[PDB]
Amino acid sequence: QISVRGLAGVENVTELKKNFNRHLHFTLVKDRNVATPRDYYFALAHTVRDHLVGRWIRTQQHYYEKDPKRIYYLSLEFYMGRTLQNTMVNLALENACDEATYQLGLDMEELEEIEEDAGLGNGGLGRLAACFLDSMATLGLAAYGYGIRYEFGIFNQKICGGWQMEEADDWLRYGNPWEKARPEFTLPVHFYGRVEHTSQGAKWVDTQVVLAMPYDTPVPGYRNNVVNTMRLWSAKAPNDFNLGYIQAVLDRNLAENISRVLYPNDNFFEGKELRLKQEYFVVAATLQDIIRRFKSSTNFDAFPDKVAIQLNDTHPSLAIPELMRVLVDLERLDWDKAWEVTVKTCAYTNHTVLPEALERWPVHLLETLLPRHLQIIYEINQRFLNRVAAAFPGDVDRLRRMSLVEEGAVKRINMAHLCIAGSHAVNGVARIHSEILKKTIFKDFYELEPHKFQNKTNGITPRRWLVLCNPGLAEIIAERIGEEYISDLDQLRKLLSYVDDEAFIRDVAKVKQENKLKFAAYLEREYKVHINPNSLFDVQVKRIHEYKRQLLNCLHVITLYNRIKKEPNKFVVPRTVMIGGKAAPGYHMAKMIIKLITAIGDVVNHDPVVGDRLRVIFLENYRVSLAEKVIPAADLSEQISTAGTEASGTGNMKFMLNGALTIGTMDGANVEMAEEAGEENFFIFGMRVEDVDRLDQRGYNAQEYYDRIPELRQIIEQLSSGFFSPKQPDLFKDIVNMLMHHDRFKVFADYEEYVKCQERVSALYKNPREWTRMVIRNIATSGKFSSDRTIAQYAREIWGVEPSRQRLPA
Amino acid sequence: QISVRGLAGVENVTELKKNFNRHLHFTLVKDRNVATPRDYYFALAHTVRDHLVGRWIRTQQHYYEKDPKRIYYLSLEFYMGRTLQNTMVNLALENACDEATYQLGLDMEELEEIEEDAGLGNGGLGRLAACFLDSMATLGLAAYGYGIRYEFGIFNQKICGGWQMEEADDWLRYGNPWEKARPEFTLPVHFYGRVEHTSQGAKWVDTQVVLAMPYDTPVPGYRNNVVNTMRLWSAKAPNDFNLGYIQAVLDRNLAENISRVLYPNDNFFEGKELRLKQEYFVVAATLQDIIRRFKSSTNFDAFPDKVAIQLNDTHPSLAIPELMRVLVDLERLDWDKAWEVTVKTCAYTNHTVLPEALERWPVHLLETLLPRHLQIIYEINQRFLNRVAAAFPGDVDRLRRMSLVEEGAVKRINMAHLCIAGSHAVNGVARIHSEILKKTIFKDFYELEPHKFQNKTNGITPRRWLVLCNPGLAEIIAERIGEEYISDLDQLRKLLSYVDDEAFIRDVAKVKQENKLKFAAYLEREYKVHINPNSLFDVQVKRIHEYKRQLLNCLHVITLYNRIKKEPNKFVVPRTVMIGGKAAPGYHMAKMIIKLITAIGDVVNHDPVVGDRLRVIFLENYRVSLAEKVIPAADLSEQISTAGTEASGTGNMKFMLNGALTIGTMDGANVEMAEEAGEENFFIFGMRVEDVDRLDQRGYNAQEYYDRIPELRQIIEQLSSGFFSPKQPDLFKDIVNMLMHHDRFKVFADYEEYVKCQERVSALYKNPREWTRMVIRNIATSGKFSSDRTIAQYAREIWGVEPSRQRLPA
Ligand SMILES: O=[N+]([O-])c1ccc(C2C[C@]3(ON2)O[C@H](CO)[C@@H](O)[C@H](O)[C@H]3O)cc1
Ligand SMILES: O=[N+]([O-])c1ccc(C2C[C@]3(ON2)O[C@H](CO)[C@@H](O)[C@H](O)[C@H]3O)cc1
Missing domain, CATH: 3.40.50.2000 (Glycogen Phosphorylase B;)
Incomplete structure (x- = not known):
């Protein structure tokens, strides 16, 4: 074929x-x-x-x-x-x-x-x-x-x-x-x-x-x-x-x-x-x-x-x-x-x-x-x-x-x-x-x-993480620059000369849509879950850990839900938010985070006012075979660890190679990825390592953020009161207590900049042509990460x- | 070939x-x-x-x-x-x-x-x-x-x-x-x-x-x-x-x-x-x-x-x-x-x-x-x-x-x-x-x-127990009566017409000698033990149990040794006595019997006066593969269970098919084997089931035999005094005590007839032609036991x- x-x-x-x-x-x-x-x-x-x-x-x-x-x-x-x-x-x-x-x-x-x-x-x-x-x-x-x-x-x-x-x-x-x-x-x-x-x-x-x-x-x-x-x-x-x-x-x-x-x-x-x-x-x-x-x-x-x-x-x-x-x-x-x-x-x-x-x-x-x-x-x-x-x-x-x-x-x-x-x-x-x-x-x-x-x-190997999992993208690239790049990934730089090519722009976007359709079909078949394939696919897949800040993602999801409920008849870019990953069997907080994600989904996915504008799905049993399916389908890659905590990351590189844009902190390899693609082509937000150090010297006080950010206050009050667990009102008390009193990873400190950055993502997604041109600039500069x-x-x-x-x- | x-x-x-x-x-x-x-x-x-x-x-x-x-x-x-x-x-x-x-x-x-x-x-x-x-x-x-x-x-x-x-x-x-x-x-x-x-x-x-x-x-x-x-x-x-x-x-x-x-x-x-x-x-x-x-x-x-x-x-x-x-x-x-x-x-x-x-x-x-x-x-x-x-x-x-x-x-x-x-x-x-x-x-x-x-x-299957383990015998039989007998073993009856055939007599005896030579070579290679291949191969292989009476065999072996030591310059038919079999790990008496056999070997095999006239070997790790080697090499099959204790036996049938003569009690299938071959062609000795019953009604008293049989008394005195264990004089006390006071299987009761019967075996072995003719009559009537x-x-x-x-x- x-x-x-x-x-x-x-x-x-x-x-x-x-x-x-x-x-x-x-x-x-x-x-x-x-x-x-x-x-x-x-x-x-x-x-x-x-x-x-x-x-x-x-x-x-x-x-x-x-x-x-x-x-x-x-x-x-x-x-x-x-x-x-x-x-x-x-x-x-x-x-x-x-x-x-x-x-x-x-x-x-x-x-x-x-x-x-x-x-x-x-x-x-x-x-x-x-x-x-x-x-x-x-x-x-x-x-x-x-x-x-x-x-x-x-x-x-x-x-x-x-x-x-x-x-x-x-x-x-x-x-x-x-x-x-x-x-x-x-x-x-x-x-x-x-x-x-x-x-x-x-x-x-x-x-x-x-x-x-x-x-x-x-x-x-x-x-x-x-x-x-x-x-x-x-x-x-x-x-x-x-x-x-x-x-x-x-x-x-x-x-x-x-x-x-x-x-x-x-x-x-x-x-x-x-x-x-x-x-x-x-x-x-x-x-x-x-x-x-x-x-x-x-x-x-x-x-x-x-x-x-x-x-x-x-x-x-x-x-x-x-x-x-x-x-x-x-x-x-x-x-x-x-x-x-x-x-x-x-x-x-x-x-x-x-x-x-x-x-x-x-x-x-x-x-x-x-x-x-x-x-x-x-x-x-x-x-x-x-x-x-x-x-x-x-x-x-x-x-x-x-x-x-x-x-x-x-x-x-x-x-x-x-x-x-x-x-x-x-x-x-x-x-x-x-x-x-x-x-x-x-x-x-x-x-x-x-x-x-x-x-x-x-x-990451471009054999498994491009040719194998995304043959459609591999093929449209090969059509223009030949096959040599598969064992010499720096050759992808040649794609910079196709950023204004109308045929290539169409092909890149077509391949992504096909991948999204295939994954939406996979979900219905094996898990009986229905998603809008026209929505932005917002994906965070990695092991569940406090440092990786799946919780920060959760806060944004709730923010989006609350904003829809406040202004239901206002247009918002539709999203499918997907979070997956395993928790270590003895890691209580990680297991509580999984429960929170599914609990948010239970509320958001069944609210008639939301419609098909927001869906929250937990991806069960995340593993290599599943990564090969979801990564080619992603629009947005969530790489949101607290600066100085993720040594490198490799999931980040997989998403870059497969035509997703990245929202991330200046942590691990994210720094070099942004350097390669250009900062204008990356959605960077939040504290740098030096900013985390300054906060540590001063003492991190979560209450300050709670007091000064009304939208954040609302979410904490919803979690505490039992909005996401009506039958068990105090279910998420451990999570709130940790966020408020002993958060090693400063979730609240990056909240405002994160939400702001996410708005810029939605803005760009409204313009398909410019979204795809930025994607091409990411794929084209991913060579260093072979x-x-x-x-x-x-x-x-x-x-x-x-x-x-x-x-x-x- | x-x-x-x-x-x-x-x-x-x-x-x-x-x-x-x-x-x-x-x-x-x-x-x-x-x-x-x-x-x-x-x-x-x-x-x-x-x-x-x-x-x-x-x-x-x-x-x-x-x-x-x-x-x-x-x-x-x-x-x-x-x-x-x-x-x-x-x-x-x-x-x-x-x-x-x-x-x-x-x-x-x-x-x-x-x-x-x-x-x-x-x-x-x-x-x-x-x-x-x-x-x-x-x-x-x-x-x-x-x-x-x-x-x-x-x-x-x-x-x-x-x-x-x-x-x-x-x-x-x-x-x-x-x-x-x-x-x-x-x-x-x-x-x-x-x-x-x-x-x-x-x-x-x-x-x-x-x-x-x-x-x-x-x-x-x-x-x-x-x-x-x-x-x-x-x-x-x-x-x-x-x-x-x-x-x-x-x-x-x-x-x-x-x-x-x-x-x-x-x-x-x-x-x-x-x-x-x-x-x-x-x-x-x-x-x-x-x-x-x-x-x-x-x-x-x-x-x-x-x-x-x-x-x-x-x-x-x-x-x-x-x-x-x-x-x-x-x-x-x-x-x-x-x-x-x-x-x-x-x-x-x-x-x-x-x-x-x-x-x-x-x-x-x-x-x-x-x-x-x-x-x-x-x-x-x-x-x-x-x-x-x-x-x-x-x-x-x-x-x-x-x-x-x-x-x-x-x-x-x-x-x-x-x-x-x-x-x-x-x-x-x-x-x-x-x-x-x-x-x-x-x-x-x-x-x-x-x-x-x-x-x-x-x-027993004649495929494994003749064709596989004894191709030489299978071939000399096939030469005369064709191949049909391998799946219709009753056809071996046709060999009765060759009992006076001088060529066949020679071939049967040649095959046995070849098998004995091969096994004597196997022993030297894998176990570094030397045996006389011209001696009578006297074999008892089966699991170690009191009812199977390996102990009765032991008593005969010691009798032979004592008779040689009494009259060293008198001629006796040379024997290699081979006993093999596993003991259940928790069966103390069975483990003591194995020790006795090796202890007798230690004395007999190193006595210069005995020379090559008597050898006692314990066959290590008896299993199916070893049975396939030793059974074709055997001259005498020991099937000496107390009458009424061995339900059938199958080892007995394997030896019959492969050209060994049988010394046995009227127990299990031995009765039918003797019936098929003719009692004159079998070395039958000892109590019948009815004789065991009579003794049980009267009460079995081992002391009576000890008192009336001087050769038996000598052996018991040798075991008790430490003749077969000089460094540990009382090693076999359990064995002597059992024999004398609580022997369920009446070892002493069959001793005299057993020794007498063994003398008749040695007498026949002195006449190679008549030994082999009796062998032919056994092989020829083994068909029922397929x-x-x-x-x-x-x-x-x-x-x-x-x-x-x-x-x-x-
Ligand atoms: O069983 N462990 O003790 C263990 C397992 C996994 C890890 C890590 C560390 C880590 O991911 N898993 O290594 C990756 C490869 O270098 C990095 O990309 C990650 O940033 C880092 O957290 C560390 C220790
Ligand atoms: O694990 N067991 O409980 C067990 C094992 C073996 C046996 C036997 C019985 C026996 O040999 N092994 O069966 C043979 C096949 O019929 C007979 O030829 C033997 O005479 C008999 O003792 C009985 C019970």
């Missing part, structure tokens, strides 16, 4: 059809008479998977022969989503499979909807890892993603009576065609035990053993025949485990629980033992794999020349003392040499400045679980603090501030401090965030080792490797 | 080679440069599996079109062993695959050794189910085996310091190529809850739900293109299970533990809740499947015309009240009609008379777990006892004896009584056993309903279906 989806050749279509029929018979053990849509999905998945294998084997043997420097990306989260369409896109198989399935009497888009998301992440951090894997393969880097194969990913969210309910995401129920179990490469991981000092160094003895079994998933690059590997470890009990008999076998579950479930906290630290076990499990298994592969190329001087380890936040921070453990205790290297190798091998990416998200492990936990690692951490701290003392003599408070060990009621290890000490590079994820790191939380470290500190602004740019920078500035767009032989 | 292994055609070999290479590439994702023997095994298994699929699909659609009466064989155990060779044998692919792998530079026999046993059974009962499945497919019956897919089968046995150690049999670690998961056919199973009485019958409410997910394994018939199904259920938690969050997900293990592990008890009842859950789990899921398939053919009058349910012992006995539950509570049938259908549908096979093996469930367990089933059981009992009272008026003691409810300290339900009441046929498993049932434990029931009671003497004969009898006399040897189209 469309050009960017590749060729549908007679030979290819014929071959795909026969392999589809082969798999249905031999693999699924079904015939066309009893086969269901799910059977058809699996037959298609196996058919496409077959095309990966040759490339996968030859890529990995190529790395063995050429022996390039290997990049190991360690993460506790990989939010991969669906794999079928992505694989077809990267292999240029989409049109061919579309034709083949059509000739078999099947609709491929229907089949694609059957696949479960691989939901092995919480949101932004996990999705970044996934975009990064795609870019690393596209840029021909010898890269390996390493993590945990959770049996249960992020929970499925159900909404019952306006409240979030959680259910287990049993994503492996029907099997995972994309993974290859590798039980032959199983590795032992040690826990507990004790340290024994001998004539020749320390020994870690009397340990409990858990086995780490790897599952490998292919990661295809964009049309370059490169297929890299994501290796995820699964926990297994040894066969003599606990070996009355029956209970011993049943107790194997205790060891195997390590890989059972993803912790569902977004930007929050929970110091549970099981989480620590997960973190060591991934690190210990991965490092053995790294060392084995290095030895199969004695001389560890060359280790940093052949190995780069990237720590995705502090979650895999134990890699630092684990590498030291292996080099000192097992390989018999002297401390100083081992440390030099470790520092040159490891690099650390920080993803947030929120204090509650920072990992600070109680010493007593590490003492019991990982006694040798604690000893190593103490020794690292002593040697590091000796360096600080030499550089800043007499500065005793600096010594306590910089220590890896924090004193108090319970002694803790600061994992961020550990990472900085043991890494040659430390980066933030957007320019403003990286600057905040050097100015505030890591100021002392920057002063000691300025060369260590870098910025690497986040990005994860190909991000990864090229990591490669050149941290890892010391050169990217390559050269094809491997097919 | 050999005829019975089929043709190796040019087209077939070429095709097998290319499909092997295809699977290695696309399925295993390996190339020849990094592939291991295990990879090669899996490539072969997938290649052979491909040949099953067409036949599997067309067999099942054939049953859908023809709608024959379906046979459902319910068992908690299916001891399948390895599948690769069996599949090749039944599909006539053995020589072709041998050639194809040879041309690829691989040894197929080496590859076959990689496959794990499917060890989902304890011994005889589980292996009977497996032989039965093979015969049902070979006889073209529409038969389905239903059970549980245990994650862990029978434990692997290790011997440490002469003691049994258990380890988990992680049989699924590398995956199971033979099963097909069918998550789409998952069914709910209910536990706990309460009974609610309404205007329209009882309702079972407030239940806990566990999901039953089926895995299907193909069961190929012998060269008839029939492929039946064994469906095994796996336990799964529902997704809202226990739905703080983390613990709820972790607690899913509680539901899923149902299918975790096989209870390792052979002939012993352990009244644990988890075992009851397993039994209901299989029954509830299976019955829903049966009813669904019946409805997809309202009128339950035809149910028994279309469905037969065979209960393999009392383990699936809950099928009776569960069928009643479904028919009465859910389908709204009247009690009397439902009962008529149930009785006509169900049949029960009893497998033992040992009191400790009989299932007697505490009422309080059933009350809590299955409250509705208990109510139904009570109602069945009341109506049954009303029938007894009408037939035998005033006989109050008969009423208490026959009741399904047993009174006492704890009230219990007798599951055997439940099965007899609710089945139209009740059978024992050998003529003597079936007679014992009518004369003793079920006398009252036989008197009430004589027509119900039948015999079905056990059998499970094809057994299944034909079940089909005609219980199930009301006719077997068929007709081919389905290929």
